[PDB]
């Protein structure tokens, strides 16, 4: 069928909870307290949603 690795019809992006980025196992990349949850990027808050 379709081959997302080649034709680029990505369809599974719906899923993705959160992503954390760390350099030297010490520092988070946007670590200057930029985002609301600056520790890591949150794609979707499941049920918590305060």
């Amino acid at each position: 069928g379709s081959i997302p690795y080649l034709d680029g019809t990505f369809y599974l992006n719906h899923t993705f909870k959160k992503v954390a980025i760390t350099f030297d196992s010490s520092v988070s990349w946007p670590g200057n307290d930029r985002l609301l949850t600056p520790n890591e990027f949150e794609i979707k808050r499941s049920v918590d949603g305060e």
């Binding site: 200057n32 307290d33 930029r34 985002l35 609301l36």
Partner: protein, 99 residues
């Protein structure tokens, strides 16, 4: 730029753009033959973002969150009052604000 690795400049990663490192001549040729033989899509034109005096290195938030200082209610309408604060070394574009 001081820390520009020369391999970058040779490989047209940063430095002079297409209209300048080329010989004047090709430039002209190209300008003339634009209509029929394109030749703009075959050289590279580097783009470089600025480094200093554009972004604050010190710890600073992006999406500030203000809470209602005082709130009033009525049978048909209600009132909400916020103490919007904009500290120094900042600028707030009201277009982003939204209740």
């Amino acid at each position: 730029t001081p820390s520009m690795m020369p391999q970058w400049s040779y490989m047209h990663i940063s430095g002079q753009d297409a209209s300048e490192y080329l010989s004047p001549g090709l430039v002209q040729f190209a300008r003339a033959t634009e209509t029929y033989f394109s030749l703009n899509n075959k050289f590279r034109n580097p783009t470089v973002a600025p480094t200093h005096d554009v972004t604050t290195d010190r710890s600073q938030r992006l999406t500030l969150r203000f809470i209602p200082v005082d709130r009033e209610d009525t049978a048909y309408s209600y009132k909400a009052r916020f103490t919007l604060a904009v500290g120094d070394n900042r600028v707030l574009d009201m277009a982003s604000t939204y209740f």
